[PDB]
């Protein structure tokens, strides 16, 4: 109910996620991948990271009135990937130009003057490979940083310099 | 063989592991996977689990004189996979008949009265799919309990029950 899934992802129900009401779909295979940071509190355990994903979703749903947490996936410093909207549902991370053509993944915390531990970066790339494997991402997939497509500081000076070293990253 | 490397694994250096002195290799592709528990302390965090891996390698090397932590991989309740001897190197987990033909996976903890969390189970299972995709395991590969191939309680009643439900399990 219903998992044989992939790159070890914590499912919605596991992090006590309110149900999603979002219906719009993404046409896979998908082209772009946007990396952002939540700009929120960071966590480094599964217990604290479950709570943080829960907290981010709540702010998005109760306060901004969105159908679900905005990101397709969330990455905690505990080294785990948190299921947001998933591979199929259009996200709300990068504005209306990019939300229907990209998969937004978000690192939990502020990474302006901080860096995510390797395990988080590992989970992230693994997450991405796991995407292609399923057909959601297209192998040619390109990684853009949040600030490359929107006036924002996200994902942070420090995380942004790292993702530039990634092999699939295009400016 | 196949460029696309698989899954997330915490590398030896990251959990501060003593250099291995172990040299006997396994013949790819391995047919059997044997699941054990450590019957030791459990840890739920990246930090506390790295320590535990260290404690276990320590005890195997310093007190029992093995060339390396005996298991090929360890699984923590933090939902992470810790690297041991790896895919290509014979371990010291299940006796001499079995060590040369199987892969040893141990869950860090005593799973007699406790089941490991879903995230632990997810990593263990994902790890195996990675083995198959990498070519280190046989697509048909068979999972066995430690107690099926040795007189032992490992991997613990609770955990034993669970692995019996895996589709690759054969007693
Ligand atoms: O783990 C890997 O990277 C190799 C491929 C594993 C993909 C998950 C297997 C699966 C996918 C969809 C439905 C059931 C199982």
Number of structural domains in chain B: 1
Contact in structure between B49 and B78 (CB atoms under 8 Å): yes
A8–B123: do the CB atoms touch at under 8 Å?
yes
CB atoms within 10 A of CB A142: 15
Resolution in Å, one decimal place: 2.5
Kindly identify which residue of chain A lies nearest to residue B10, measuring between CA atoms: A119
Alpha helices, H only, chain B: 46-58, 118-134, 146-149, 157-163
A5, A78, A123 ranked by CB distance to B78: nearest = A78
Expressed in angstroms, the distance from the first to the final Cα of chain B is: 32
Question: Which of B7, B81, B133 has the most ligand 1 atoms within 8 A of CB, as the residue to mutate?
Answer: B133
A133: Cβ below 6 Å to ligand 1? yes
Distance from C-alpha of B131 to C-alpha of B32, rounded to nearest angstrom: 11
A119, A133, A134, A141: which to substitute to probe chain B, counting the most B Cβ within 10 Å? A119
Specify the CATH number for the domain of residue B12: 3.40.80.10
Q: Is A139 exposed, middle or buried (0-12, 13-18, 19+ CB in 10 A)?
A: exposed
Q: Do A126 and B7 touch (CB under 8 A)?
A: yes
Name the token pair of B55.
């404690």
Q: Domain of A106?
A: 1-171
Q: Which one, of A29, A119, A48, lies nearest residue B14 by Cα? A: A119
Read off the tokens for A8: 């070890």
**Which of B7, B10, B118 shows the shortest C-beta gap to A14?**
B118
Side-chain half-sphere CA neighbours of A65 within 13 A: 0
């Amino acid at each position: 109910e219903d998992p044989p899934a992939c790159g070890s992802i914590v499912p919605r129900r596991e992090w006590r996620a309110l149900a999603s009401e979002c219906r719009e779909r993404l046409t896979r295979p998908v082209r772009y991948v946007v990396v952002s940071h939540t700009a929120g509190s960071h966590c480094d355990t599964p217990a604290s990271c479950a709570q943080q994903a829960q907290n981010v979703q709540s702010y998005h749903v109760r306060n901004l009135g969105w159908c679900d947490v905005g990101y397709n996936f969330l990455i905690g410093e505990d080294g785990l990937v948190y299921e947001g909207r998933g591979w199929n549902i259009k996200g709300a991370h990068a504005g209306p130009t990019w939300n229907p053509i990209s998969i937004g993944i978000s690192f939990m915390g502020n990474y302006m003057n901080r860096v995510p531990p390797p395990r988080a970066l590992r989970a992230a790339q693994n997450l991405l490979a796991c995407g292609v494997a399923l057909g959601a991402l297209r192998s040619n997939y390109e990684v853009k940083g949040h600030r490359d497509v929107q006036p924002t500081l996200s994902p942070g000076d420090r995380l942004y310099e790292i993702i530039q070293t990634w092999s699939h990253y295009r400016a």
